Structures are given as C-alpha cells and as structure tokens.
Design a protein around this nucleic acid. Structure first.
Length: 258
DNA sequence: CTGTTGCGCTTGG
DNA sequence: CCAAGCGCAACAG
C-alpha cells in the first residue's frame, strides 16, 4: 500500500485496539503530525513506513564566509544537534557547497541524527511512533534508535506545486496549443478526450502538470525553487529487541491512560 | 490574488 | 533500489 493508505491502516488499528481516541490529520499538511490522540494527556503519533524520511531543515551556503546558514524561514529552531551538523558541514564546506539533487551524505555518528530526531519530534508534541513489519510496532520517541537505522544527507529538494490560477491561464493554454492538444476549458477546469493524465508541458517559465481527478483534469504549476535541505532517512531494523518492544507497548498503554 | 519557500510523504524510473 | 520531487499551508507582497 502507499503511505496514505498506511497511515489510515495505523489509525484503524489504534482505534480498534485502544478505543476510539485517534484521528488522522490532513494528507501532506506540513504543519502538524500524522495522528492525534484525544484524552487528558493529548499527544501526536507519527506513522512511518519501514523506509521513510523523518524531518529536515534548509541550509543556505554562504560562499563569502565559507559556512552554512540556517534558513530564517525554517519551521523549527536550531537545537544542539542541528549545530553539530552545521559545524561539520561548514568545516567541510568545499565538500558540501556544491548543491546537488543526488545528495551528499553526512558521516557523523548516528546518535547525532537520532538525537536531532528526538528533539525535533518532542518539539512537535509527538510522543510515539507507529510502524509495521507485518505486526504493528508502537514505541516512545526516546527509544527511536532501538527500532530504526538513521542516515542523513544534504540534497536539493525542489519545492512543491500550486494550483493553476487565472493569471497563468493564458500561458497554460499557449502551452497546450503548442503541443497540439485538443481541449476546452471552463474557468480553471480542463476537458480533453486526449490521454493527458500526468502530462507535463511548459511555457513562459512555467512547468505544468496535468492531474486527473473526478471526471476531468486538475492542473498544477510546479515550483522554480531548488534549495537544499539536511534531511533524515530511516530504515526499520530487522533485529528489534522483543524485550524493548514489549515494555514500549506498556509505555504507550500508560500514556493513553493518564 | 499570486508566487516563494519549507515540510509533509517515500517513490518509481 | 537510489536519485529525486509534488501536495500541502503560511507567508510577503
């Protein structure tokens, strides 16, 4: 299943097993965490697939100073582990200053990255993670390293899309016409008997993406922002202590009972 | 009202 | 399986 279905699967399990106290938040909403527990001890739960990413922050190369600057537009604050990562990258500036989509790994001790994750998720009011290897695994954030291997890379990650808008409509129609596509439009709604699902076309410095939903097409404008972020990847361990697993399930049971 | 950015999410070439 | 990015919301203008 995909990540959206996986999160629903986790919420269904939580409500079935522990009562109707858990709610999934909006898909792709970056301002909140995946699952909210309702109770006198409220907290969020992150659902993670076995191979997932797990937080980021943008760094801007300062070529005049040969160091990295923490973006003032980042949505979490510098913690001591952020600072260790920035120090390593800045002291190795020539190795990281040339940004790439392939990414440059950061070979610091894994504990630095685990500690970043623990601080970051604490700051988001996330007390537990849920994952699955065929059975559901629920654990408190302080035990993260017993469940996931963590790595960290610095890579360009293009920013996301936006909806086609009225101002961009002439440019979009011009791009369609140059491609020879037969279509009509009612406002921002596109109609075509051609097979244009997931089609990419461009014009006047705009890259468009045509998505099919309902009974017609929804057009997106892709970003032109290509900044680079430190970003964490996690891989579920194949060998997890059953002793830790069982005590962590009891810790979850305590948290929802407070 | 529009375009930019950073964070969500593993993904699919 | 590894180089790579779109769906989303807050922001500034």
């Amino acid at each position: 299943m995909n990540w959206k279905e996986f999160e629903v699967f986790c919420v269904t399990y939580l409500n079935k097993t522990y009562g109707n106290k858990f709610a999934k938040k909006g898909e792709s909403d970056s301002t909140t965490s995946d699952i909210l527990f309702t109770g006198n001890n409220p907290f969020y739960i992150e659902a993670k697939m076995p191979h997932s990413q797990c937080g980021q922050f943008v760094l801007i190369p300062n070529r005049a100073e040969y160091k990295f600057d923490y973006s003032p537009k980042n949505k979490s604050e510098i913690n001591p582990y952020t600072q260790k990562i920035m120090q390593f990258m800045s002291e190795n500036f020539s190795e990281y200053a040339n940004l790439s989509t392939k990414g440059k790994i950061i070979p610091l001790p894994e504990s630095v990255f685990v500690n970043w994750i623990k601080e970051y998720y604490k700051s988001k009011s996330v007390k537990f993670f849920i994952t699955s290897n065929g059975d559901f695994i629920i654990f408190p954030i302080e035990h993260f390293e017993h469940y996931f291997n963590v790595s960290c890379t610095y890579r360009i990650k293009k920013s996301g899309s936006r909806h086609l808008n009225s101002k961009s409509l002439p440019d979009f129609k011009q791009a369609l016409d140059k491609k020879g596509i037969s279509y009509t439009m009612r406002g921002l709604e596109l109609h075509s008997d051609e097979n244009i699902h997931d089609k990419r076309i461009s014009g006047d410095d705009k890259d468009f993406l045509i998505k099919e939903n309902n009974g017609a097409y929804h057009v997106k404008i892709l970003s032109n922002t290509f900044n680079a972020n430190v970003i964490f990847s996690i891989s579920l361990k194949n060998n997890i202590s059953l002793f830790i697993l069982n005590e962590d399930r009891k810790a979850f049971e305590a948290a929802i009972s407070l």
